[PDB]
Design a protein around this motif. Structure first.
Motif, PDB file in Angstrom:
ATOM      1  N   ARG A   1       0.824  -1.195   0.000  1.00 18.63           N
ATOM      2  CA  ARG A   1       0.000   0.000   0.000  1.00 18.63           C
ATOM      3  C   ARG A   1       0.864   1.253   0.000  1.00 18.63           C
ATOM      4  O   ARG A   1       1.866   1.332   0.713  1.00 18.63           O
ATOM      5  CB  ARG A   1      -0.918  -0.034   1.216  1.00 18.63           C
ATOM      6  CG  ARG A   1      -1.759   1.170   1.404  1.00 18.63           C
ATOM      7  CD  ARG A   1      -2.783   0.942   2.466  1.00 18.63           C
ATOM      8  NE  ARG A   1      -3.468   2.175   2.818  1.00 18.63           N
ATOM      9  CZ  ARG A   1      -4.482   2.244   3.664  1.00 18.63           C
ATOM     10  NH1 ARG A   1      -4.942   1.141   4.227  1.00 18.63           N
ATOM     11  NH2 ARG A   1      -5.044   3.408   3.937  1.00 18.63           N
ATOM     12  N   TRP A   2       0.484   2.227  -0.828  1.00 15.75           N
ATOM     13  CA  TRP A   2       1.269   3.445  -0.967  1.00 15.75           C
ATOM     14  C   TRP A   2       0.962   4.437   0.149  1.00 15.75           C
ATOM     15  O   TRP A   2       1.850   4.810   0.920  1.00 15.75           O
ATOM     16  CB  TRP A   2       1.013   4.081  -2.334  1.00 15.75           C
ATOM     17  CG  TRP A   2       1.853   5.284  -2.576  1.00 15.75           C
ATOM     18  CD1 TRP A   2       1.477   6.581  -2.453  1.00 15.75           C
ATOM     19  CD2 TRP A   2       3.225   5.300  -2.978  1.00 15.75           C
ATOM     20  NE1 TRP A   2       2.527   7.409  -2.748  1.00 15.75           N
ATOM     21  CE2 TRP A   2       3.612   6.643  -3.075  1.00 15.75           C
ATOM     22  CE3 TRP A   2       4.162   4.305  -3.264  1.00 15.75           C
ATOM     23  CZ2 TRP A   2       4.893   7.022  -3.447  1.00 15.75           C
ATOM     24  CZ3 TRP A   2       5.433   4.683  -3.632  1.00 15.75           C
ATOM     25  CH2 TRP A   2       5.788   6.028  -3.721  1.00 15.75           C
ATOM     26  N   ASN A   3      -0.294   4.874   0.241  1.00 12.34           N
ATOM     27  CA  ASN A   3      -0.693   5.862   1.230  1.00 12.34           C
ATOM     28  C   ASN A   3      -0.656   5.268   2.640  1.00 12.34           C
ATOM     29  O   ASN A   3      -0.752   4.051   2.803  1.00 12.34           O
ATOM     30  CB  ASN A   3      -2.086   6.400   0.899  1.00 12.34           C
ATOM     31  CG  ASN A   3      -3.102   5.313   0.687  1.00 12.34           C
ATOM     32  OD1 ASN A   3      -2.779   4.140   0.704  1.00 12.34           O
ATOM     33  ND2 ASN A   3      -4.351   5.704   0.513  1.00 12.34           N
ATOM     34  N   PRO A   4      -0.474   6.102   3.671  1.00 16.20           N
ATOM     35  CA  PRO A   4      -0.382   5.580   5.038  1.00 16.20           C
ATOM     36  C   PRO A   4      -1.683   4.964   5.527  1.00 16.20           C
ATOM     37  O   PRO A   4      -2.774   5.252   5.034  1.00 16.20           O
ATOM     38  CB  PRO A   4      -0.025   6.817   5.862  1.00 16.20           C
ATOM     39  CG  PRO A   4       0.624   7.717   4.920  1.00 16.20           C
ATOM     40  CD  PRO A   4      -0.079   7.520   3.626  1.00 16.20           C
ATOM     41  N   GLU A   5      -1.545   4.095   6.518  1.00 17.96           N
ATOM     42  CA  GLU A   5      -2.659   3.327   7.043  1.00 17.96           C
ATOM     43  C   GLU A   5      -3.171   3.931   8.342  1.00 17.96           C
ATOM     44  O   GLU A   5      -2.469   4.669   9.034  1.00 17.96           O
ATOM     45  CB  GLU A   5      -2.253   1.867   7.260  1.00 17.96           C
ATOM     46  CG  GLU A   5      -1.894   1.177   5.971  1.00 17.96           C
ATOM     47  CD  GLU A   5      -1.625  -0.303   6.114  1.00 17.96           C
ATOM     48  OE1 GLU A   5      -1.632  -0.803   7.248  1.00 17.96           O
ATOM     49  OE2 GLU A   5      -1.404  -0.969   5.084  1.00 17.96           O
TER      50      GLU A   5
ATOM     51  N   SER B   1       8.817   6.344  -0.279  1.00 17.02           N
ATOM     52  CA  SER B   1       7.402   6.563  -0.477  1.00 17.02           C
ATOM     53  C   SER B   1       6.802   7.120   0.814  1.00 17.02           C
ATOM     54  O   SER B   1       7.418   7.024   1.877  1.00 17.02           O
ATOM     55  CB  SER B   1       6.734   5.249  -0.877  1.00 17.02           C
ATOM     56  OG  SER B   1       6.783   4.317   0.179  1.00 17.02           O
ATOM     57  N   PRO B   2       5.616   7.735   0.749  1.00 16.59           N
ATOM     58  CA  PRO B   2       4.963   8.179   1.991  1.00 16.59           C
ATOM     59  C   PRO B   2       4.599   7.049   2.938  1.00 16.59           C
ATOM     60  O   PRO B   2       4.497   7.285   4.146  1.00 16.59           O
ATOM     61  CB  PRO B   2       3.716   8.908   1.484  1.00 16.59           C
ATOM     62  CG  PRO B   2       4.081   9.354   0.150  1.00 16.59           C
ATOM     63  CD  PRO B   2       4.942   8.304  -0.429  1.00 16.59           C
ATOM     64  N   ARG B   3       4.410   5.834   2.438  1.00 13.03           N
ATOM     65  CA  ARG B   3       4.214   4.701   3.327  1.00 13.03           C
ATOM     66  C   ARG B   3       5.527   4.277   3.975  1.00 13.03           C
ATOM     67  O   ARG B   3       5.562   3.983   5.173  1.00 13.03           O
ATOM     68  CB  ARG B   3       3.595   3.538   2.563  1.00 13.03           C
ATOM     69  CG  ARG B   3       3.313   2.336   3.418  1.00 13.03           C
ATOM     70  CD  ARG B   3       2.179   2.614   4.364  1.00 13.03           C
ATOM     71  NE  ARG B   3       1.956   1.497   5.274  1.00 13.03           N
ATOM     72  CZ  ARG B   3       2.495   1.396   6.480  1.00 13.03           C
ATOM     73  NH1 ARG B   3       3.264   2.360   6.944  1.00 13.03           N
ATOM     74  NH2 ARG B   3       2.240   0.339   7.232  1.00 13.03           N
TER      75      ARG B   3
ATOM     76  N   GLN C   1       6.485   6.666   6.571  1.00 13.57           N
ATOM     77  CA  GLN C   1       5.675   6.456   7.765  1.00 13.57           C
ATOM     78  C   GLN C   1       6.190   5.278   8.585  1.00 13.57           C
ATOM     79  O   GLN C   1       6.131   5.303   9.818  1.00 13.57           O
ATOM     80  CB  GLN C   1       4.224   6.225   7.353  1.00 13.57           C
ATOM     81  CG  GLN C   1       3.224   6.219   8.473  1.00 13.57           C
ATOM     82  CD  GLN C   1       1.834   5.919   7.986  1.00 13.57           C
ATOM     83  OE1 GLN C   1       1.639   5.583   6.824  1.00 13.57           O
ATOM     84  NE2 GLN C   1       0.855   6.058   8.861  1.00 13.57           N
TER      85      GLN C   1
END
Lengths: 105, 97
Positions: A63-67, B74-76, B79
């Motif tokens: 997954r790219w965007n944060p969870e 990446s932004p993930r 994080q």
């Protein structure tokens, strides 16, 4: 699966049963075949330890965007959550579940 | 190698180890011809203030820059870095054209 949630076990962790052994009080100096009804009133105390080993299953997500994750509110408050009060009383403010990460179907 | 043979593959991934993370990036670039293959003296001859004067040279050369953290994370993966680690530092890099 248990309907209140958890792990269904055919052989669960066993019951651990504990009891104060009866210490009788002063018996009569003549014999009586009846059972004892007078005991020394006593209780017991001690320490108990439980040590469970858990096996984890790590995320392997692309997954790219944060969870979405469980965080504490980092704003000013009277009492810090999941701590004690001024009277020394521990409290839990909310139920914390466990489904925060995501997997595809 | 030759004309009809690829000289490399697309590697754009990040692998997390016990105390390592190896962030690999791949981009497509385009390089024009700068200054029409000339070295040019440049300066503040066209009226700059005293704090704004410079003197230098413009080259026909391009340069590759990857001095940003989003070029690699990446932004993930950023994080994962910032919520689990008290520190990080780079150890080695590897560059390919």
């Amino acid at each position: 699966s248990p309907l209140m949630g958890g792990f269904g076990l055919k052989h669960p962790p066993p019951q651990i049963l504990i009891k104060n052994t009866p210490v009788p009080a002063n018996p009569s100096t003549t014999f009586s075949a009846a059972k004892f009804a007078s005991f020394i009133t006593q209780y017991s105390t001690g320490q108990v330890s439980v040590e469970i080993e858990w096996e984890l299953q790590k995320e392997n997500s692309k997954r790219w965007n944060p969870e979405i994750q469980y965080t504490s509110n980092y704003n000013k408050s009277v009492n810090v959550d999941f701590t004690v009060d001024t009277n020394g009383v521990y409290s839990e403010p909310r139920p914390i579940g466990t489904r925060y990460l995501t997997r595809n179907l | 190698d030759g004309v009809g043979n690829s000289s490399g593959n697309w590697h754009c991934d990040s692998t997390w180890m016990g105390d390592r993370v190896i962030t690999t990036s791949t981009r497509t670039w385009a390089l024009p011809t700068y200054n029409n293959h000339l070295y040019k003296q440049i300066s503040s001859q066209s009226g700059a203030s005293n704090d704004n004067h410079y003197f230098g040279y413009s080259t026909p050369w391009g340069y590759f820059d990857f001095n940003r953290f989003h070029c690699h994370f990446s932004p993930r993966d950023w994080q994962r870095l910032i919520n689990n680690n008290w520190g990080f530092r780079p150890k080695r890099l590897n560059f390919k054209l």
